[PDB]
Structures are given as C-alpha cells and as structure tokens.
Design a protein around this ligand. Structure first.
Ligand code: HEM
Ligand SMILES: *[C@@H]1O[C@H](CO)[C@@H](O[C@@H]2O[C@H](CO)[C@@H](O[C@@H]3O[C@H](CO)[C@@H](O)[C@H](O)[C@@H]3O)[C@H](O)[C@H]2NC(C)=O)[C@H](O)[C@H]1NC(C)=O
Ligand SMILES: *[C@@H]1O[C@H](CO)[C@@H](O[C@@H]2O[C@H](CO)[C@@H](O[C@H]3O[C@H](CO)[C@@H](O)[C@H](O)[C@@H]3O)[C@H](O)[C@H]2NC(C)=O)[C@H](O)[C@H]1NC(C)=O
Ligand SMILES: *[C@@H]1O[C@H](CO)[C@@H](O[C@@H]2O[C@H](CO)[C@@H](O[C@H]3O[C@H](CO)[C@@H](O)[C@H](O)[C@@H]3O)[C@H](O)[C@H]2NC(C)=O)[C@H](O)[C@H]1NC(C)=O
Ligand SMILES: *[C@@H]1O[C@H](CO)[C@@H](O[C@@H]2O[C@H](CO)[C@@H](O)[C@H](O)[C@H]2NC(C)=O)[C@H](O)[C@H]1NC(C)=O
Ligand SMILES: [Ca+2]
Length: 595
C-alpha cells in the first residue's frame, strides 16, 4: 500500500519531551509516532474509502455510473422529501437548553475541520461553478430536482466545492483520497489558541509581559472584552449589513463568526483566558509572559475537557456511554488519537438541534426590547448584533433560558438552516445545510449506512420491513427507500440520524457507537488529558473538578442569575440562583514558591 508519510504539513517541529505544554500544532503528544493527532493531516480511516472509480471521484458525479445497481439520489431531493418541515411548533427540547446545542458546536470545532478547496486568487473556476453550474475538477454542484422552488429564485444549482486532500491539492492519483484535518485532534481548546504556530502568535498581546490575549480596541462590552476584529477585507460579516461596517471576530478557528451564538461562547472563552492569566500574575508575580499564556492555556484545556466529558457527553450518548466510554485508567500510548473521517459526519447530528429563533433577554429574563426574538438566518456572520445591539449579556441569558430543538423523524433540520443558509464567500441567503452535508458524505467517500451499521455490530437492514424495525417508523423508512432503493446506499448522515434515540440520551444506536469510540480514543490517546497523573498536580485536579459552565458565565459576564445545571431545561425564576451559590475555581495550588 502506502505512501507511509505523504503530504507537507508544518514541516518544522522537533520535540522537547520535557516540556509540560502541548504544541499549538498538536505534534509531540505521542513519543513513539510524533505526528499522531497533529494538525493538517489525513483524517483517520476506520473503513476503506468508497469512490465510484475506487480512487477519488464521488458517488453522484457521473450520470451513467451507479452505486450498487442504482442511481444515487440528488443531494437536495433527499432533503426536500425527508429532511424539511414547516410547522415549528413543538420541536423544542423540553429537557435541554440552547447551550446543549451550543456546546456541541464548540467541542466539534475544537476537534475537527476539513477546509474547502477554494484554490486560486483571481479565478474563473469559481465563476463557472456558481454561474453556470459546470461540474468538473474541484467544483461539485448540488443540482435542483424538478419543481424546486429555488429554481425560480436561485438558478439551476447550489455552488459546492470539494474538500481539501492530502499530498498536494492539484488532482493526482495513487491511494484513495483522504481529506485534511486543519485542526488538532486532541480536545485542547484550539478554537481559542489556534492550530498554526503562525496564527497562535497573532492572537496574543505580545505588547506586555502578562501572557494576555489580543482584544478588540474599537468596541467594549461594559468594560469586558471582545475578540479582535479580522481586518481582512472583503469579509462576510460586513456584507450582511453594509451600513454597520462591523467585521467578523478573529479566533484560532475560522468558523468563529458563522453564527451569533458561536461567537458568543468564543467571547466567554477568550475572556476567561485573560482572567486566569491575570489571577496567575496575582499569585505568581515573578512569572514571565510565556508561563502565563501557557499555564492559562492549560487550565482552559482542562476546563473544556471536564465540561465535555462530565456534563455534555453523559446527556448525549446516554445509557450507551459506559458501554463505549468506560472510566479512565491511564494514558495508552497504543491508541490512535486521530479523528476519523466518519466522525466529521457523526457529530453533525447537532444540525437537527438548532431551533428557528435566537432570543435576547434582559436582567429580569424578560424579552429584551422590540426585536428580542430574531430569525436565525439573519444571524449567520452577524457580529453587528453583538457589538451594536446589547453585547453578549442578552444572548448568554437566552442560552440558559431557551430550549434546544429536539431531533424528530418528521421534523429534522430547521428551514432557517435547510433553506436560508449563508455561505461566507457567496452572496445569497439560500443554501441547504442538509444538501451540503449529503454531498460531503459523498465527497469524503463515505461507505453507506450498512457498512457502518456492521462496523458497530448492529443488524444490517436490507429489506423495507427490515429498515422499519430499526427506524421504528413505517412512513420514513418508505420515503428513504423510494429514493435510495437500498439501505446499503443510504448516506451515513441521514441514515444515522433517522434512527430513534437511545435511552436517556440524544442520539441513536449507530451514532452512539461512532461518537462513543472517538471520544474514548481522544481521551485515552491524549498524553495531556487532565486526569492522567503528571499533567496536573494532585491538588490542582481537585479544584478543576469544581468548574461549571455556570461559573464561566458568572466570572465573565454581568449575568447574576444562573442555573446550577446549565445543560438541562431551566425556568425563571425557580431554577435560577445567585452566582454566589456556584462553586469558584480556586487557583491557589498554582502558586509556585522560591526558597
Ligand atoms: C447555527 C449553528 C450552526 C451553523 C450555522 C453551522 C454551520 C456549519 C457549516 C456551513 C458547516 C460546513 C459543512 C460542510 O461544508 O461540510 C459546518 C460544519 C460542521 N458542523 Fe456545524 N453549524 C452549526 C452548529 C453546529 C453544532 C451545534 C454542531 C455540534 C453539535 C456542529 C457540528 C459540525 C461539525 C462536526 C462540522 C464539520 C467539522 C469539520 O470541518 O470537520 N455544527 N457547520
Ligand atoms: C444595519 O445596522 C444598523 C446598526 O448599526 C441598524 O440601524 C439601527 O436600527 C435600529 C432600528 O431598527 C435603530 O434603533 C432605534 O433606536 C432606539 C434604540 O437605539 C429605539 O428606541 C428605536 O425604537 C429604534 O429601534 C438604530 O438607531 C439604528 N442605528 C442607526 C442610527 O443606524 C440597521 O437596522 C441595520 N440594518 C440591517 C439591514 O440589518
Ligand atoms: C432531564 O435530563 C437531566 C440531565 O441528565 C436529568 O437529570 C438526571 O436525573 C437522574 C436522577 O436519578 C440521574 O440519572 C440517573 O437516573 C437513574 C437513577 O435513578 C439511573 O438509572 C441512571 O443510570 C442515572 O444514574 C442524573 O444524574 C441526572 N443528571 C444530572 C447529571 O444532573 C433529568 O432526570 C431529566 N428529566 C426528565 C425528563 O426526566
Ligand atoms: C494589551 O495589554 C495592554 C496592557 O494590559 C492593554 O492596555 C490596557 O488597555 C486597557 C483597556 O483598554 C486600559 O484600561 C483603561 O484605561 C483607562 C483607565 O484610566 C480607562 O479610562 C480606559 O477606558 C481603559 O479601559 C489600560 O489603560 C491599558 N494599559 C496600559 C498598560 O496601557 C492593551 O489594550 C492590550 N492590547 C491588545 C490589542 O490586546
Ligand atoms: C491499551 O489499549 C489498546 C487498544 O485498545 C489495547 O491493545 C489491545 O490488546 C489486546 C489484548 O488485550 C490485543 O488483542 C489487541 O491487539 C489490542 N487492541 C487493539 C484495538 O489494537 C491494550 O490492551 C491497552 N493496554 C493497556 C496496558 O491498557
Ligand atoms: Ca483540537
């Protein structure tokens, strides 16, 4: 097979092995195979890639060719018939907050990214894709089926570009096509600190010896910080309201400004880096800026680890967790920490948890002003609503008080995501996230629903009656097969999502498995996982056990009323208490001494 080590990454990183700090790139975690889990390398393959030419060409590319003796259904046709719904009433999750959706997006963004193939600088390859919908090379258009209302308004297709691949980005051929993970595979708060040594520095305040991080100079949220602006024009954030002139935020992750609430938790995280950084110079005045940045970076890492695994995961995987993520037993140097290709489609389960509206509430948890409840589609790359319409305080209260959208077989993805999505480079408010997910499955060369079913050790449904038993839904299983013709061909995203949810959790049998395995691999294969003896001192761990997302809000906002359990559905005022009832993170054990 091979090549054994293709591609060019950040080709200049040799290990210190004696440093107690993670590399920005994620290198040097593993002593034996040191590029394992790093950034800018092939997503791991749990199962062999599936292309029609067996090498690189997606299923759906050529019209004459077929998948298992059937034509693959159009990306959007799958959506129009199965994914969409009209009536938004009763789709709310009665036992999970908007934060349950929100944190999903934070971890994931920490864990993976597969950068698009917008290669070029002054180009007509972008034009022949968008204007003419000409398939070929790095352009893979999402066509519109007969009687799509988007034909009248938008055109003949939705522009779609293939994902970036290993070795170089001009076509080529040898092994099957593997897609690139632009971020580090460890749960290491890279959304904040970056995955490139080049960018990791740009985000830092290297003007003072305090290990602080660059903050906005133009705007201020009641004396509290905002992220810096991305002064790289043209920007998507400016385009949406030209009169405002407000550009996107800049963090260690490109997707920080995609939606308004994701930029909000980005503000909270950046805020507590500086708070830890400041409290550490209170306690350790002799420390240089480097120790400060790094020591703060280490606590925040541990922060995102404890919240993800103690608070988030148990309510996602549910009864299935102990089956897949048993209790911790130490760092296994034989476990592959890399994020697999399929995982980048498993974690997308959350797209069906995004509700139609984002609300802004006041101190009394009452609707804030005339335009309190906004449509979500108006909030893609919307930063002017943060900076010039209340700050983050109203949006944070919304997260804690308002419900998440519950997954439903008859009501899947909101039309605000499935019909009105804004994509950063393009101009209109009209892409389909359901269709975009469905061709990326095909682009990445995913094997079908059944391979993955079997991979996890679950009955591989082959008949109409078979699929029924698994999906516990006769009408959905029939629509699925009328389009896919066989359950072997169902795209992993929709197939995995269609399944009913496990007990006490928010995902079904197949997804619990795929998600379950990854999260254990990235816990067990991480040399810097907080609990692993050596990383944090015995005392340091005891304080880290006390962190809560509620405390992140209290110490970095002028919200004073917070629920204790921030991922479950809480009502005002009964479930809300004072910030004083919420346990503080004691940073005393970090106090190093001299004589
Ligand atoms: C309104 C909120 C959200 C918006 C607007 C949004 C939008 C997007 C878009 C446009 C993509 C690119 C898809 C592609 O081209 O393949 C994406 C990727 C992704 N999203 Fe979301 N998303 C949201 C929330 C979430 C949440 C809450 C989660 C997790 C629970 C999530 C999980 C993911 C994952 C895993 C990817 C692929 C990551 C990778 O690059 O490998 N998203 N999102
Ligand atoms: C483009 O961005 C600007 C903000 O930079 C938006 O303009 C603002 O629009 C609202 C009206 O919807 C104005 O608020 C008004 O004043 C007070 C609150 O400050 C309130 O009592 C009034 O009832 C009213 O809501 C605000 O002054 C105005 N800013 C100015 C002077 O430009 C604009 O709506 C955005 N448009 C788009 C295309 O989204
Ligand atoms: C809504 O979700 C809440 C968050 O999980 C959940 O709170 C959970 O309540 C039970 C208390 O019993 C705990 O789960 C345990 O339940 C039984 C024990 O009687 C066992 O079978 C389970 O294995 C499990 O240990 C959770 O600890 C607790 N969650 C947390 C972390 O606070 C509510 O119960 C849910 N509300 C509804 C709709 O019932
Ligand atoms: C990099 O770090 C610098 C030092 O920590 C920081 O400069 C400080 O900025 C704050 C906030 O803008 C200023 O605090 C306040 O100054 C007066 C107080 O009398 C107020 O009237 C202002 O409203 C302001 O809030 C400090 O004056 C300033 N400190 C120093 C040492 O000059 C930079 O802003 C940081 N730069 C970046 C890009 O992150
Ligand atoms: C560390 O984890 C690895 C991977 O799960 C374990 O390696 C397995 O060892 C079994 C024997 O029990 C072998 O049959 C397999 O070859 C290994 N499995 C895999 C997935 O490769 C190992 O048991 C663990 N080691 C320690 C010390 O905990
Ligand atoms: Ca990471």
């Amino acid at each position: 097979s091979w090549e054994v080590g293709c591609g060019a990454p950040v080709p200049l990183v040799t290990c210190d092995e004696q440093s107690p700090y993670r590399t920005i790139t994620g290198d040097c975690n593993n002593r034996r195979s040191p590029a394992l889990g790093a950034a800018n390398r092939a997503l791991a393959r749990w199962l062999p890639a599936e292309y029609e030419d067996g090498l690189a060409v997606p299923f759906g590319w050529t019209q004459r060719k077929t998948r298992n003796g059937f034509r693959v259904p159009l990306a959007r046709e799958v959506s129009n018939k199965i994914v969409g719904y009209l009536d938004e009433e009763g789709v709310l999750d009665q036992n999970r907050s908007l934060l349950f959706m929100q944190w999903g997006q934070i971890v994931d963004h920490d864990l993976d990214f597969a950068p698009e193939t917008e290669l070029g600088s002054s180009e007509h390859s972008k034009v022949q894709c968008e204007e003419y919908c000409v398939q070929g090379d790095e352009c893979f258009p999402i066509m519109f089926p007969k009687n799509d209302p988007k034909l009248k308004t938008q055109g003949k297709c939705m522009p779609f570009f293939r994902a970036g691949f290993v070795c170089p980005t001009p076509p080529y051929q040898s092994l099957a096509r593997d897609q690139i993970n632009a971020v580090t595979s460890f749960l290491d708060a890279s959304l904040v600190y970056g995955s490139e040594p080049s960018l990791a520095s740009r985000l830092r305040n290297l003007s003072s010896p305090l290990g602080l991080m660059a903050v906005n100079q133009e705007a201020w949220d009641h004396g509290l910080a905002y992220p810096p602006f991305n002064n790289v024009k043209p920007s998507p954030c400016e385009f949406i309201n030209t009169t405002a002139h407000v550009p996107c935020f800049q963090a260690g992750d490109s997707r920080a400004s995609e939606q308004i609430l994701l930029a909000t938790v980005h503000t909270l995280l950046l805020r507590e880096h500086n708070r830890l950084a400041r409290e550490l110079k209170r306690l350790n005045p002799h420390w240089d800026g480097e120790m400060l940045y790094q020591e703060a970076r280490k606590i925040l890492g541990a922060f995102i680890q404890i919240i993800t695994f103690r608070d988030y995961l148990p309510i996602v995987l549910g009864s299935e967790m102990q089956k897949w993520i048993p209790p911790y037993q130490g760092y296994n140097n034989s476990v592959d920490p890399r994020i697999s290709n399929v995982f980048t489609f498993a974690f997308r389960f959350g797209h069906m948890e995004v509700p139609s509206t984002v609300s802004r509430l006041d101190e009394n948890y009452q609707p804030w002003g005339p335009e309190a409840e906004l449509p979500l589609h108006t909030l893609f790359f919307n930063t002017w609503r943060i900076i010039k319409d209340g700050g983050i305080d109203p949006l944070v209260r919304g997260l804690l008080a308002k419900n998440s959208k519950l997954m439903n077989q008859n009501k899947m993805v909101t039309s605000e995501l499935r019909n009105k999505l804004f994509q950063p480079t393009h101009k209109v408010h009209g892409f389909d996230l359901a269709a975009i997910n469905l061709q990326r499955c095909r682009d990445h060369g995913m094997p079908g629903y059944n391979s993955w079913r079997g991979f996890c050790g679950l009955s591989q449904p082959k008949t109409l009656k078979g699929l029924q038993a698994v999906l516990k839904n006769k009408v959905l299983a029939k629509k699925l097969l009328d389009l896919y013709k066989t359950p072997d061909n169902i795209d992993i995203w929709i197939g995995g999502n269609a399944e009913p949810m496990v007990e006490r959790g928010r995902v079904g049998p197949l997804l619990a498995c795929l998600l379950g395995r990854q999260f254990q691999q990235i816990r067990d294969g991480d040399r810097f996982w907080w609990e692993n003896p050596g990383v944090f001192t015995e005392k340091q761990r005891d304080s880290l056990q006390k962190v809560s997302f509620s405390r992140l809000i209290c110490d970095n906002t002028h919200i004073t009323k917070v629920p204790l359990h921030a991922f479950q559905a809480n009502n005002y005022p009964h479930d809300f208490v004072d910030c004083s009832a919420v346990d503080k993170l004691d940073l005393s054990p970090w106090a190093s001494r001299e004589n």
